[PDB]
Amino acid sequence: RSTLVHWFRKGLRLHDNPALSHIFTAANAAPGRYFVRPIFILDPGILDWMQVGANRWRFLQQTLEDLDNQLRKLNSRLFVVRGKPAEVFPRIFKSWRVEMLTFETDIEPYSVTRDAAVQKLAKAEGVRVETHCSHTIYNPELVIAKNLGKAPITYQKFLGIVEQLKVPKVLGVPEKLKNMPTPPKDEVEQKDSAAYDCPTMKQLVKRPEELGPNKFPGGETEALRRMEESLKDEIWVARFEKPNTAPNSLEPSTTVLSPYLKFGCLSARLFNQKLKEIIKRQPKHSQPPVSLIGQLMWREFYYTVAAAEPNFDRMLGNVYCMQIPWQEHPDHLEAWTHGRTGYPFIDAIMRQLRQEGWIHHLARHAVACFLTRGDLWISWEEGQRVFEQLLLDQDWALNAGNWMWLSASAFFHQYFRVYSPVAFGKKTDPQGHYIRKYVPELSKYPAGCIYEPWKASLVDQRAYGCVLGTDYPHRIVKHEVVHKENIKRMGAAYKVNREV
Numbered sequence: 001r002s003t004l005v006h007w008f009r010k011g012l013r014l015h016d017n018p019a020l021s022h023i024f025t026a027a028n029a030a031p032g033r034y035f036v037r038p039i040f041i042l043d044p045g046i047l048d049w050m051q052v053g054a055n056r057w058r059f060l061q062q063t064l065e066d067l068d069n070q071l072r073k074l075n076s077r078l079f080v081v082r083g084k085p086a087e088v089f090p091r092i093f094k095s096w097r098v099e100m101l102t103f104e105t106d107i108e109p110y111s112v113t114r115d116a117a118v119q120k121l122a123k124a125e126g127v128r129v130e131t132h133c134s135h136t137i138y139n140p141e142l143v144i145a146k147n148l149g150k151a152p153i154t155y156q157k158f159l160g161i162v163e164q165l166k167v168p169k170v171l172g173v174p175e176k177l178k179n180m181p182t183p184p185k186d187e188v189e190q191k192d193s194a195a196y197d198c199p200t201m202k203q204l205v206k207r208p209e210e211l212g213p214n215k216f217p218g219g220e221t222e223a224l225r226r227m228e229e230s231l232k233d234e235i236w237v238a239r240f241e242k243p244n245t246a247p248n249s250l251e252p253s254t255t256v257l258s259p260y261l262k263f264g265c266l267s268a269r270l271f272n273q274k275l276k277e278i279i280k281r282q283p284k285h286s287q288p289p290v291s292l293i294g295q296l297m298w299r300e301f302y303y304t305v306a307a308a309e310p311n312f313d314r315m316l317g318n319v320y321c322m323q324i325p326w327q328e329h330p331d332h333l334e335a336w337t338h339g340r341t342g343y344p345f346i347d348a349i350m351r352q353l354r355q356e357g358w359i360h361h362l363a364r365h366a367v368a369c370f371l372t373r374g375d376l377w378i379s380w381e382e383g384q385r386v387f388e389q390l391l392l393d394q395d396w397a398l399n400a401g402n403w404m405w406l407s408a409s410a411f412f413h414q415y416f417r418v419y420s421p422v423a424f425g426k427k428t429d430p431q432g433h434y435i436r437k438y439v440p441e442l443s444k445y446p447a448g449c450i451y452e453p454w455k456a457s458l459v460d461q462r463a464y465g466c467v468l469g470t471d472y473p474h475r476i477v478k479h480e481v482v483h484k485e486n487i488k489r490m491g492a493a494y495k496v497n498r499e500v
């Protein structure tokens with residue numbers, strides 16, 4: 001008796017999962033011949049390649065527990081294997097007598113390298129490998145091909161390409177396993193009956209004092225619930241216009257399905273299909289790029305450009321990216337990282353990010369502009385690394401692609417438009433409720449200067465219980481000075497890149 005193995009990496013869901021579906025149907029169409037090991041590998045190597053904060057560790061822990069729970073309802077379970085794939089797969093290929101291995105493809109360079117070696121091993125031991133592109137709606141390879149070998153570098157050209165492509169069939173959950181015995185314990189399982197159990201919170205989250213509020217629980221189950229909750233107001237959905245959603249409402253102004261889409265707890269193909277059903281129903285609706293389907297197409301767009309550039313997450317060696325002489329300033333980077341810039345709107349956002357792991361798109365705009373071309377003139381690579389640690393939805397292609405946009409390094413070139421750290425939040429939160437919540441030490445400043453506490457006299461600062469420089473920091477830079485200097489630095493950068 002040989003084993004069929006589905007390998008979870010992303011695609012942490014039962015629904016719309018062709019690679020996992022196939023394994024299951026094969027076991028049921030040939031009962032008695034197969035064991036089934038759905039596995040997730042706790043790869044220590046990924047830590048040398050990306051930062052993971054406490055909040056995202058908890059989201060992953062919750063996700064694996066849910067996935068194990070969902071698999072048990074199918075007379076299976078999740079087998080979480082600790083170790084490096086390059087060392088894990090040669091062992092289990094033999095100890096399990098693996099016939100077929102399926103997984104969902106991923107375009108990240110670490111994923112490509114790792115998968116190539118696993119496919120070299122699988123070819124050596126005579127193991128059949130079947131891969132499926134189900135993490136995105138469109139296959140970046142096919143988009144690039146249809147555009148004659150280059151990724152479209154504008155959103156509109158990208159849309160024109162994928163409109164001519166076939167939308168995939170969205171699958172349901174696999175059928176329950178018919179008369180399947182629990183596989184026999186292997187070398188590892190026998191010395192430890194729990195060697196493959198889902199990891200507890202205590203095993204994955206080493207810095208539990210950095211956990212914030214538990215607001216967006218991991219798991220396919222929670223992802224499906226949150227999608228359904230979001231789709232209930234078909235009018236909000238159909239008339240959604242991303243630029244008009246607020247960055248600083250106390251409740252999120254968008255869906256917050258991003259962590260679920262990042263891990264594959266929600267199939268983007270399923271989400272796309274549910275959106276298209278509502279739009280069909282609702283003749284007055286928005287269109288890309290501002291619509292909700294337009295937001296899914298932003299995700300596809302960045303995945304497509306990223307798939308063609310292994311150096312997508314850095315400035316050097318990146319075919320898309322303007323070469324800009326970003327400066328080093330550790331103290332400023334530390335202030336921005338910990339929301340101690342002295343600009344309450346910026347600080348409020350960075351503290352929400354650290355505590356909760358999610359901030360609104362335009363809140364990302366505000367803090368990214370401030371760090372890079374706007375104010376601090378610090379490389380977008382540094383902001384990307386901080387976002388990578390703190391975000392639940394940390395996504396190699398999205399995190400990089402949007403930082404390049406926000407810094408005027410690629411895709412976006414109107415660097416003369418600069419967000420004010422004082423004025424931008426006022427449009428949607430003139431009372432400063434957001435600042436009061438995440439910068440509580442300012443909670444007694446009136447609206448007239450909560451965005452600019454340095455315009456309150458010392459007497460008033462003592463009256464509000466928050467003296468600048470003691471209880472809340474002074475501005476680390478003067479926006480009105482540096483943003484004009486940085487515009488000229490950008491123009492000089494753009495001239496140098498144009499001549500080369």
Ligand SMILES: Cc1cc2nc3c(=O)[nH]c(=O)nc-3n(C[C@H](O)[C@H](O)[C@H](O)COP(=O)(O)OP(=O)(O)OC[C@H]3O[C@@H](n4cnc5c(N)ncnc54)[C@H](O)[C@@H]3O)c2cc1C
Pocket residue numbers: 242253254255256257258259261262295296298299300302359360361362364365368387391393394395396398399400402403406
């Ligand atoms: C500096 C910066 C860094 C970012 N880093 C990430 C990241 O690490 N991970 C991430 O998923 N998104 C990232 N984004 C894009 C965007 O901010 C988030 O996708 C969005 O805030 C998620 O909230 P939501 O789920 O409510 O989005 P909604 O408005 O509800 O959109 C639904 C889905 O569409 C996609 N989407 C929406 N906006 C964008 C966008 N601009 N680009 C690409 N896909 C988009 C996401 O899958 C999202 O879950 C970043 C943007 C900026 C400016």
